[PDB]
Ligand binder design. Structure first.
Ligand code: TGL
Ligand code: HEA
Ligand code: HEA
Ligand code: PEK
Ligand code: DMU
Ligand code: CUA
Ligand code: PER
Ligand code: CU
Ligand code: MG
Ligand code: NA
Ligand code: ZN
Lengths: 43, 71, 227, 104, 144, 46, 57, 514, 84, 49, 93, 259, 75
């Protein structure tokens, strides 16, 4: 397949932000619940 | 001058050569597997039970104190 | 029981479990050969710059790759079905034991002569004696005579469970309203472990089975003293 | 059909005096579908057809695809070029190597 | 040269080893001199220069076979980055072991395991091949 | 009639990549987080 | 009865851009609104009920 | 405008897109449920609570992955986008009913999430066997909300299947016979005939469970003369065909991908591929009690189910080899889509081969209700149905969106996932042979080493999932718009451009009858 | 078979109406006669509290929870027996 | 002209690999994970009764 | 009597198709077109209401592969697999 | 502007309303079964009936009033209905399977015999035979209706259809009375469970088929059907034969052989 | 008498009817001996067989129901 160059290029730094915010959107809520599991278990 | 090389059926010739290789390897593997795993197994059981003495095995376990029903 | 880093079956403890080991060896050899043939043909197809992209004729090659597999299946089915029918053969038991699944324990009933029955519960981890196996020990073991043909009958009085002892090759579901039979013969004395093998609620993981296989005369005296 | 009848069909295909540019492309693109490198005499008829169609570039491309169809058999392309040399000479067809077009 | 989205229904150019003569010329608009070159191509190709022969090739096609078939260093990036995220995954499992998991059961303490191992040998666990088979009951040690 | 073409045959906007990042984060993250929170619900119950 | 299909054909073919579910006139709009109101209100109510049933009582 | 377009749709492409979005969101829920599983099992002891909570997680994991992830992607998503394009049809036969198929899934998903929020959840297994799923051992609303969830998912797929079968038989060009349709379209049709026949039987059996729970019937209760095992037969009479349903559209996409990145105009042995799909379809309805080999069935019944089950290897082997023969002589394009398909071919074959080990009722006595089963079915699902989904996704993403993915990132994603799933599931064969049962929150100490590794592999898969999401972001963020796609002559769905207009084939193709 | 009648030249409306009035509806009047005759109350059998009958694992969601949806006091006993 | 891979390829590879090997070696040996390996050839059996 | 006929009451596209079929016509493409000999002198004639239509060519009877390509207004085009000729004939309905 | 013969349907809200109404009815039956309330259920039944009425109203608009049902569109409807009925046959099949499983191997709890101890079945030669003759008769009167319609005969079409509907209604009243009279109930073990569930789903299908025949009766009153184009009527006729065949299998299985 | 022997009438894994039938037989036999003023001890074999085979909760439940008048088998 051929394609045009990006209309709105996403630089290395922008990819690092996208990637980081993506990993954190999955990690933080689940990490928060898991870390507080003992607090739940005795409640 | 260069001699004329084969120019036709190159893909088919390569295929033939390697399928026969694969068949040969496969017989050779069957051979090794029946030696290293299957006969090894049959022989371990055969050798174990050949002169196995169940009462003696029991008495050793009983002396070791493992049983509820036999002190 | 299973030991750390185990790869295959627990060592066989009955003739029928031995037979299942050899038949598994035979089938896995086929499994390994077919999948390594596939992986190999795959790498063969992908490692050449030579091309042949025009229509290829398919009626010829399809014979091989239809008949060979049929043959291999028959080579599997034949020893498979021999073992099947062996497990079904009439055998004349000397003893019948019933086990009833419950949430979450087994009870055993040995009622050919006297009314002997008792309940068999996992030893909690904090009460294990030194050397004992987490999740696997019970307070009252299923004591049985070694080298004898025993008929086990398996049922439940609440939800499904399933009665398993991997060493002997046994797994018989425990369904309420029904009486399932299996036959149990140990070639050797000792302790043989299993775990409930149908999901049955909060403590499915914690209602194990321990057979204790000993000489007839020791079994008889234990039976008497269990009354 | 025999090897010889196959080759003769292709030769005659490219030898058609008023072969058009579509038939040229269709013949070449069909032919490289097969499990073979084309005989010199088929490539010769396709190269003469490029000449009657006034298309020097497709002649160079035909040479490239001979070399490509041979895959790892590195002896095949120098042989075919050896055999085409009088034709290459007569039509003024430069090889891809003589044009630098074998460099990456 | 310039390919447009709204051209999808028109024959298009492709560089593929198995489609050597694509449906259109890579370059269709010609300059004054490119036009003079196509006229010249109608006469003997022996009179074309090497440079002219190249320029005709480059009007008709975009990349040569050796260009389009070239290998790249992409694998180093794919393999390196895959190891990187796999490496990243270990950080998650470190966090999990530190903050999520508590102590494991006392049955894995070294003295429990030693006694449990003796007891497995006393009950002859897997005496044919799996476990006890590897203990020497005469020399009182693991088979060497 | 409807807009057509890249970016327009979808129920979400891709006009701004950062707003898009927010929207995709909420959408996938809410999927991922729900079982954690249901587990929590259940622990905090009885 | 008399065959009045032709009239309905003329009504439902009127070039007014209306979707078929609203082309019959003003009653179609009422029945639509009643339907969609019961469905969305009933749906918010089933959520409320879930919230309620989600905790011990 | 918005609501007309996306809530009132009658367009196959926009409904196909909604299914893709729904199925991706379900994939994240399913992935979370699966990490909770492996976290519980990732060290010896009890992480979350006892078996009740653990198996509510286990049950929802299965239901979400099968019903809300795999089927909606493959059939609602790829099926609705692609099948009308590939037969030059202007839409589906019933475009309005097609949209109710879609809109039944969010409420079916809500009832599943409700079931887990009320009471103590349905900790029953995705097979919902009684009496554990009955009103004494699972008193209260959770199992009923589960049943109702399945009713709606059922109705959704039975109306889908009627739509697909009708559209495929009735809406081809007048010159095109059924043997001139692409293999993906054949796989959707066969798949839909299976949904049509099998889901009404599951609906009957889960209805009897509902009445047993709520109307004092006793279909499955021995006190009124019923039989728990009748429920298993009903369920399985659906459940075996269901797994052929989860795979067949995956086989279709595979054949399109392999063909396309081998530079081939057509798959090897077309008619054999058809015959194989129809045979697997048919055979998939007569083998169901291979899920019952420990329940206490007579021996001849077990002999026959062992043999009928094995025979499926033959047509399935025809497909595997025709895929290899399609690669043979290809001009091989190493795209991320091709890598997922090559992995599919090998890792499906491994999980199909341990299916065959399990078909042997004698050995299944010892493998049944152990992790050997679990390793089998994740090879074919996590590395079979899922690999096809991923290869289909990266392949047709530019068609659906008009934008390209970054191939390098997509290659990295494949590599991470490949390692993560193999590290997860491979050691579970050892766990299974050595006797670890299914549906356990904890295990005897000897099983620790493999459970630890398996849990670690599951985390590696997590990272692959989160990466996929960033990759899809990146594509939409950067906006590299597609220009030329090769092989359109034998890939009609690409010929209206990327993305195709809302309405395509307003003037049908012209195909001569000759 | 063929039953014992005739026509088959054409299956038209006249034939099907002939069958509706000359066979089908007389069969209905026959069966309706046979039934409105064997009707009359059959003598309710002694109550025996069999444990496989009158099942109650959960109260019915109507009434007092203990009565079936079409409960007929004459002929359906409750688990404790016939009603006053 | 050199693409991303010509310029960064060797470094991504060297440093992805170093980092992967390091952190997994750390995780595996330094944080209290109990692998439960076979006692065979490593545990000295001890009297339990 | 009393039951309308299609002649009396059929409407919209149903009517258009039924009236065109009486005239032996197929404006809504219900039938498959019969092939001509497909030469440059006798190309298959492809009606269209725009200036391009996608053609599917079944090169040989019972091929399972159909070959698909846009036909554009202008000189005849050839199937890229078998070279059979097609020519568009635009406008109307 | 299309030049194929297929129907592109105007964007419609009835799919979403039908979906939500499924959510309200299943949520509703939950609340009824477990939380002693019928409110959700009643709201779901309501929006369901509204959705069906408007969706099928619109199909009528599209066909009789707008002319979208070309032969090809019609052929597709035929496949759709035949497929739907197939799936309804499989659904009954699971209930027949349950019946034979229980009855071929009666468990000790029933007395080890079928019909169970304490079960006194209806006499199949009584009202169940009447029901049979009624449904068979209504298959004959509906075929009369179909031929009249093809023959362009308005009045005999409506008379035969009315007769077919009154017979469906008679079956339904007879069956409701039989339910009242029956000395066994749904709670009477697997015998009551299989009896009432299988015949009660059949009764539901009779009501639904009767309602479909009534829709056709009023369309015919309003002259919608031509002598050649009347798919609504065909579909309902096929549904009706389906409902009759089902009953003949119930009669033979549960009432006769299972007595 | 060790245990119940193999009975060719119940050759399969499900042994539920083996138990039931021997339970019935024993109790029919007692009834008939006790009608015709005979010796119940001829019935003892079926008692041993059903005792060996049958779960205690099933005999106990069936005993209660025969005492209650609600046993569904025919004796
Ligand atoms: C991930 C953790 C692994 C831990 C390893 C074991 C430790 C040894 C201790 C130290 C060794 C101690 C010696 C004692 C031997 C006792 C053996 C036994 O009792 O009896 C039976 C055992 C024997 O098992 C084994 O002998 C290991 C088999 C390894 C197969 C090849 C895969 C290895 C590839 C790469 C790494 C694995 C992940 C890739 C997975 C790929 C999926 C196939 O149990 C099994 O059944 C497991 C296999 C299940 C069936 C699936 C088979 C199809 C596989 C595909 C073939 C790929 C083609 C080439 C292979 C392709 C490679 C180029
Ligand atoms: C499709 C089916 C499917 C899939 C893909 C998976 C994936 C996984 N499952 Fe599985 N699992 C089942 C179906 C599936 N599973 C079933 C049916 C059972 C048994 C239920 C029961 O016993 O009752 C089960 C049981 C089961 C168990 C056994 C529980 C027990 O017996 O106690 C385990 C434990 O490790 C497990 C783990 C996992 C893990 C780690 C994955 C991982 O491989 C997952 C990693 C993530 C993905 C593969 C994401 C996939 C796709 C998307 C995110 C969509 C992307 C969207 C677009 C591109 C549009 N599962
Ligand atoms: C996409 C999902 C999928 C697919 C396609 C399959 C395919 C197969 N399954 Fe699988 N199965 C599951 C999903 C799947 N299964 C699930 C979810 C469960 C558990 C359900 C539960 O309890 O929750 C399960 C459980 C299950 C069981 C029950 C085990 C038990 O519970 O004890 C069995 C038993 O026979 C089985 C067998 C097979 C077989 C023979 C195939 C065959 O179709 C595979 C055929 C393929 C091949 C053989 C490889 C290709 C062929 C060749 C290369 C040719 C040559 C090969 C030979 C000659 C052998 N499966
Ligand atoms: C002439 C026959 C007409 C049938 C309609 C009658 C009225 C009730 C409405 C329900 C219709 C649905 C049919 C099947 C449902 C189950 C039972 C119905 C058959 C019936 O009506 O049986 C009655 C029991 O009704 C009961 O329990 C009442 C149960 C009423 C609650 C209905 C249950 C709701 C759950 C059904 C969910 C259906 C899920 C189906 C999904 C289909 C696939 C998507 C029998 O009466 P009895 O007093 O027990 O015996 C007579 C004693 N003289
Ligand atoms: C199954 C998939 C799960 C993947 C594993 C997730 C790995 C990364 C988890 C990061 O998430 C967090 O990290 C914390 C610590 O690292 C937490 O902070 C807690 O910990 C602190 C440090 O003790 C305090 O600063 C805070 O108040 C706080 O509540 C917590 O909130 C959480 O969001
Ligand atoms: Cu008992 Cu699981
Ligand atoms: O189901 O395999
Ligand atoms: Cu199956
Ligand atoms: Mg089981
Ligand atoms: Na755990
Ligand atoms: Zn052609």
């Amino acid at each position: 397949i051929t394609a045009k160059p990006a209309k709105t290029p996403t630089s290395p730094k922008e990819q690092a932000i996208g990637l980081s915010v993506t990993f954190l959107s999955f990690l933080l809520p689940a990490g928060w619940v898991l870390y507080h599991l003992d607090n739940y278990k005795k409640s | 001058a260069l001699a004329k090389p084969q120019m036709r059926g190159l893909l088919a010739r390569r295929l033939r050569f390697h399928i026969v290789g694969a068949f040969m390897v496969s017989l050779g593997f069957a051979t090794f597997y029946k030696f290293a795993v299957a006969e090894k197994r049959k022989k371990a059981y055969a050798d174990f039970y050949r002169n196995y003495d169940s009462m003696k095995d029991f008495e050793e376990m009983r002396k070791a104190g493992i049983f509820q029903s036999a002190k | 029981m299973a030991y750390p880093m185990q790869l295959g079956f627990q060592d066989a403890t009955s003739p029928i479990m031995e037979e299942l080991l050899h038949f598994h060896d035979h089938t896995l050899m086929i499994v390994f050969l077919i999948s390594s043939l596939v992986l190999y043909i795959i790498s063969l197809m992908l490692t050449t710059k030579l091309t042949h992209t025009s229509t290829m004729d398919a009626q010829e090659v399809e014979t091989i790759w239809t008949i060979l597999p049929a043959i291999i299946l028959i080579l599997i089915a034949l020893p498979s079905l021999r073992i099947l029918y062996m497990m079904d053969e009439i055998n004349n038991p000397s003893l019948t034991v019933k086990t009833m699944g419950h949430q979450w324990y087994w009870s055993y009933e040995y009622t050919d002569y006297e009314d002997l029955s008792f309940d068999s519960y996992m030893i909690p981890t904090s009460e294990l004696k030194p050397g004992e196996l987490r999740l696997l020990e019970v307070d009252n073991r299923v004591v049985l005579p070694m080298e004898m043909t025993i008929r086990m009958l398996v049922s439940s009085e609440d939800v499904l469970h399933s009665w398993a002892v991997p060493s002997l090759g046994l797994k018989t579901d425990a369904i309420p309203g029904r009486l399932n039979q299996t036959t149990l013969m140990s070639s050797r004395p000792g302790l043989y472990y299993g775990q409930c093998s149908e999901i049955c609620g909060s403590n499915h993981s914690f209602m194990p089975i321990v057979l204790e296989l000993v000489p007839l005369k020791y079994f008889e005296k234990w039976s008497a003293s269990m009354l | 059909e025999t090897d010889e009848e196959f080759d003769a069909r292709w030769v005659t295909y490219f030898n058609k005096p008023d072969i058009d540019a579509w038939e040229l492309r269709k013949g070449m693109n069909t032919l490289v579908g097969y499990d073979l490198v084309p005989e010199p005499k088929i490539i010769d008829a396709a190269l003469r057809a490029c000449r009657r169609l006034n298309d020097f570039a497709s002649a160079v491309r035909i040479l490239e695809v001979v070399k490509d169809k041979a895959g790892p058999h590195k002896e095949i392309y120098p042989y075919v070029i050896q055999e085409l040399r009088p034709t290459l000479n007569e039509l003024g067809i430069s090889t891809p190597e003589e044009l630098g077009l074998d460099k990456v | 040269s310039v390919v447009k989205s709204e051209d999808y229904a028109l024959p298009s150019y492709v560089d593929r080893r198995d489609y050597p003569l694509p449906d259109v010329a890579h370059v269709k608009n010609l300059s004054a001199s490119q036009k003079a070159l196509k006229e010249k191509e109608k006469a003997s190709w022996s009179s074309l220069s090497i440079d002219e022969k190249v320029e005709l090739y480059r009007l008709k096609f975009k990349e040569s076979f050796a260009e389009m078939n070239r290998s790249t260093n992409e694998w180093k990036t794919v393999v390196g980055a895959a190891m990187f995220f796999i490496g990243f995954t270990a950080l998650l499992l470190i966090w999990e072991k530190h903050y999520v998991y508590g102590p494991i059961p006392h049955t894995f303490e070294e003295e429990w395991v030693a006694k449990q191992t003796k007891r497995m040998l006393d009950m002859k666990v897997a005496p044919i091949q799996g476990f006890s088979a590897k203990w020497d009951y005469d020399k009182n040690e693991w088979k060497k | 009639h409807y807009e057509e073409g890249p970016g327009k045959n979808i129920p979400f906007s891709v006009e701004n990549k950062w707003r898009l990042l927010a929207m995709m984060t909420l959408f996938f993250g809410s999927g991922f987080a729900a079982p954690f929170f249901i587990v929590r619900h259940q622990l905090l119950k009885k | 009865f008399e065959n009045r299909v032709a009239e309905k054909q003329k009504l439902f073919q009127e070039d007014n851009g209306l979707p078929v579910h609203l082309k019959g006139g003003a009653t179609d709009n009422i029945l639509y609104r009643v339907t969609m109101t019961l469905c969305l209100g009933g749906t918010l109510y089933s959520l409320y009920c879930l919230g309620w049933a989600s905790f011990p009582h | 405008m918005f609501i007309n377009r996306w809530l009132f749709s009658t367009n196959h492409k926009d409904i196909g897109t909604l299914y893709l979005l729904f199925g991706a969101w379900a994939g994240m829920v399913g992935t979370a449920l699966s990490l909770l599983i492996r976290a519980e099992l990732g060290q010896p002891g009890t992480l979350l609570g006892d078996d009740q909570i653990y198996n509510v997680v286990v049950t929802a994991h299965a239901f979400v992955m099968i019903f809300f992830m795999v089927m909606p992607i493959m059939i609602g998503g790829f099926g609705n986008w692609l099948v009308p394009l590939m037969i030059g049809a202007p839409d589906m036969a019933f475009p309005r009913m097609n949209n109710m198929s879609f809109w039944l899934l969010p409420p079916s998903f809500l009832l599943l999430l409700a079931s887990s929020m009320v009471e103590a959840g349905a900790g029953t297994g995705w097979t919902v066997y009684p009496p554990l799923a009955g009103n004494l051992a699972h008193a209260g609303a959770s199992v009923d909300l589960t049943i109702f969830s399945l009713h709606l998912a059922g109705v959704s797929s039975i109306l889908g299947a009627i739509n697909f079968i009708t559209t495929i038989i009735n809406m081809k060009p007048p010159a095109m016979s059924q043997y001139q349709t692409p293999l993906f379209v054949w796989s959707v049709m066969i798949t839909a005939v299976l949904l049509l026949l099998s889901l009404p039987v599951l609906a009957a059996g889960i209805t009897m469970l509902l009445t047993d729970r709520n109307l004092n019937t006793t279909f499955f209760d021995p006190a009124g003369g019923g039989d728990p095992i009748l429920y298993q037969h009903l369920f399985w009479f659906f459940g075996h065909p269901e797994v052929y349903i989860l795979i067949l559209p995956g086989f279709g996409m595979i054949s399109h991908i392999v063909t396309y990145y081998s530079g081939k105009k057509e798959p090897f042995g077309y008619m054999g591929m058809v015959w194989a799909m129809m045979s697997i379809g048919f055979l998939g309805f007569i083998v169901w009690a291979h899920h019952m080999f420990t329940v206490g069935m007579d021996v001849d019944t077990r002999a026959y189910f062992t043999s009928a089950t094995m025979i499926i290897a033959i047509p399935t082997g025809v497909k595997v080899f025709s895929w290899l023969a399609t690669l043979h002589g290809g001009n091989i394009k190493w795209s991320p889509a091709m890598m997922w398909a090559l992995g599919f071919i090998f890792l499906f074959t491994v999980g199909g081969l341990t299916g065959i080990v399990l078909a042997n009722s004698s050995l299944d006595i010892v493998l049944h209700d152990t992790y050997y089963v679990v390793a089998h079915f994740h090879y074919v699902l996590s590395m079979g149905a899922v690999f096809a989904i991923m290869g289909g996704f990266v392949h047709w993403f530019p068609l659906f969106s008009g934008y390209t993915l970054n191939d390098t990132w997509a290659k990295i994603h494949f590599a991470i996932m490949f390692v993560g799933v193999n590290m997860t599931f491979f050691p579970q064969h050892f766990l299974g042979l050595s006797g670890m049962p299914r549906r356990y929150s904890d295990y005897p100490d000897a099983y620790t080493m493999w459970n630890t590794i398996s849990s670690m592999g599951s985390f590696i898969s997590l990272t692959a999932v989160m990466l996929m999401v960033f990759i899809i972001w990146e594509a939409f963020a950067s906006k590299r718009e597609v220009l030329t796609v090769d092989l359109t002559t034998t890939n009609l769905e690409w010929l209206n451009g990327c993305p195709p207009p809302y309405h395509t084939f307003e003037e049908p193709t012209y195909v001569n009858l000759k | 078979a063929s039953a014992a009648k005739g026509d088959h030249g054409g299956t038209g409306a006249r034939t099907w109406r002939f069958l509706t009035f000359g066979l089908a509806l007389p069969s209905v009047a026959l069966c309706t006669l046979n039934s409105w005759l064997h009707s009359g109350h059959r003598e309710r059998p002694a109550f025996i509290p069999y444990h496989h009958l009158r099942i109650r694992t959960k109260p019915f969601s109507w009434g007092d929870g203990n009565h079936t949806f079409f409960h007929n006091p004459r002929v359906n006993p409750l688990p404790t027996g016939y009603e006053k | 002209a050199p693409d991303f891979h010509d310029k960064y390829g060797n470094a991504v590879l060297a440093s992805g690999a170093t980092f992967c090997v390091a952190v997994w070696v750390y995780m595996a040996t330094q944080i209290g994970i109990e692998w439960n390996p076979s006692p065979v050839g490593r545990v000295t059996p001890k009297e339990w009764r | 009597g009393g039951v309308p006929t299609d002649e009396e009451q059929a409407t919209g596209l149903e009517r258009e198709v039924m009236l065109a079929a009486r005239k032996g016509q197929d404006p809504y493409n219900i039938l498959a077109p019969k092939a001509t000999s497909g030469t440059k002198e006798d190309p298959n004639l492809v009606p269209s209401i725009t200036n391009k239509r996608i053609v599917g060519c079944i090169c040989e009877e019972d091929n399972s592969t159909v070959i698909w390509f846009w036909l554009h207004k202008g000189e005849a085009q050839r199937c890229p697999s078998c070279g059979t000729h097609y020519k568009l004939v635009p406008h109307q309905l | 502007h299309q030049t194929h013969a297929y129907h592109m349907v105007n964007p419609s809200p009835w799919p979403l309303t039908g979906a939500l109404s499924a959510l309200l009815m299943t949520s509703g039956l939950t609340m009824w079964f477990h939380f002693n309330s019928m409110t959700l259920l009643m709201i779901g039944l309501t929006t369901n009936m509204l959705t069906m009425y408007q969706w099928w109203r619109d199909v009528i608009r599209e066909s009789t009033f707008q002319g979208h049902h070309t032969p090809a569109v019609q052929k597709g409807l035929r496949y759709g209905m035949i497929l739907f009925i197939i799936s309804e046959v499989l659904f009954f099949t699971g209930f027949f399977w349950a019946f034979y499983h229980s009855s071929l191997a009666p468990t000790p709890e029933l007395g080890g015999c079928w019909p169970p101890t304490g079960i006194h079945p209806l006499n199949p030669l009584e009202v169940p035979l009447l029901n049979t003759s009624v449904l068979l008769a209504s298959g004959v009167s509906i075929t009369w209706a179909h031929h009249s319609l093809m023959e362009g005969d308005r009045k005999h079409m409506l008379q035969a259809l009315f007769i077919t509907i009154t017979l469906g209604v008679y079956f339904t009243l007879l069956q409701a009375s039989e339910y009242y009279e029956a000395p066994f109930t749904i709670s009477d073990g697997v015998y009551g469970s299989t009896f009432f569930v299988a015949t009660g789903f059949h009764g539901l299908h009779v009501i639904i088929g009767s309602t479909f025949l009534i829709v056709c009766f009023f369309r015919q009153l309003k002259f919608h059907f031509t002598s050649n184009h009347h798919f609504g009527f065909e579909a309902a006729a096929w549904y009706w034969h389906f409902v009759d065949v089902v009953w003949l299998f119930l009669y033979v299985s549960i009432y006769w052989w299972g007595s | 008498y060790q245990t119940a022997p193999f009975d060719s009438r119940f050759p399969n894994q499900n042994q539920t009817r083996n138990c039931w039938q021997n339970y019935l037989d024993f109790h029919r036999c007692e009834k008939a001996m006790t009608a015709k003023g005979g010796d119940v001890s001829v019935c003892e074999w079926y008692r041993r067989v059903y005792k060996s085979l049958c779960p205690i909760s099933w005999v106990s439940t069936w005993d209660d129901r025969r005492a209650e008048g609600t046993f569904p088998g025919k004796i």
